Amino acid sequence: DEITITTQPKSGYVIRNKPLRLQCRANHATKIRYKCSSKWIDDSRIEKLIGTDSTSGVGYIDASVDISRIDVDTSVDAFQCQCYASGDDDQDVVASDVATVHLAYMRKHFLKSPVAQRVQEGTTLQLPCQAPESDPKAELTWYKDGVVVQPDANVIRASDGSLIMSAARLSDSGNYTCEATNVANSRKTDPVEVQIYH
Numbered sequence: 001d002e003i004t005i006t007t008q009p010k011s012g013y014v015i016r017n018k019p020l021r022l023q024c025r026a027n028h029a030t031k032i033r034y035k036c037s038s039k040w041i042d043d044s045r046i047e048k049l050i051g052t053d054s055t056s057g058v059g060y061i062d063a064s065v066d067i068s069r070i071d072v073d074t075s076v077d078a079f080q081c082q083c084y085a086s087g088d089d090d091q092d093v094v095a096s097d098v099a100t101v102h103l104a105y106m107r108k109h110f111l112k113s114p115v116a117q118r119v120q121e122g123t124t125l126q127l128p129c130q131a132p133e134s135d136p137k138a139e140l141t142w143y144k145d146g147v148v149v150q151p152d153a154n155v156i157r158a159s160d161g162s163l164i165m166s167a168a169r170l171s172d173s174g175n176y177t178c179e180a181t182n183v184a185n186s187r188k189t190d191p192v193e194v195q196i197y198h
């Protein structure tokens, strides 16, 4: 018969340095070859499972491959892959559904870090924090003396990630750390101290 794709490679992310496994199975097929961003992947990296169904008696080939960060760097950060089922010369090559591969990362250093400040009581306090270049956008959480800053009437979380106190209270004196948690990594800022005087 003709070659049909049993299972399609699924789109996903490359978290950290954890690869993204792409699986692809075809019936009546002898070989499976992947192609990412117009560049064939070495068959040394492909794990091929070849057999025959004990009931149907049809030949199948199940192939997987780990897409690492190195493949993304060598090649738009989002690229496309798809397998190709091969066989006898008369057999026509059938391509599969193309799966796009995204990269999840987080850089080394924050873009805007908080600095220690001595602020007069009743003055509007602002402690900036901009996460490192991350994709997806990392979540910002503030800590004060080891406890998480819970926004209240005085403290408000701004859209730019900066922590803003409308009226600086003496209690607001603490060591503040900004944490940027991402799917790829989690980093914290250098602890800075702020003190309020009257």
Ligand SMILES: *[C@@H]1O[C@H](CO[C@@H]2O[C@@H](C)[C@@H](O)[C@@H](O)[C@@H]2O)[C@@H](O[C@@H]2O[C@H](CO)[C@@H](O)[C@H](O)[C@H]2NC(C)=O)[C@H](O)[C@H]1NC(C)=O
Pocket (backbone or CB within 6 Å): 145, 173, 174, 175, 193, 194, 195
């Ligand atoms: C901001 O922090 C400093 C330092 O705190 C200590 O060291 C940190 C790394 C962490 O381990 C904290 O839990 C420690 O307490 C504070 O200065 C210290 O204050 C403690 C009393 O709370 C005192 O025993 C130490 O001698 C002080 N100095 C040092 C070098 O530790 C400072 O008070 C904090 N500021 C605010 C507003 O909370």
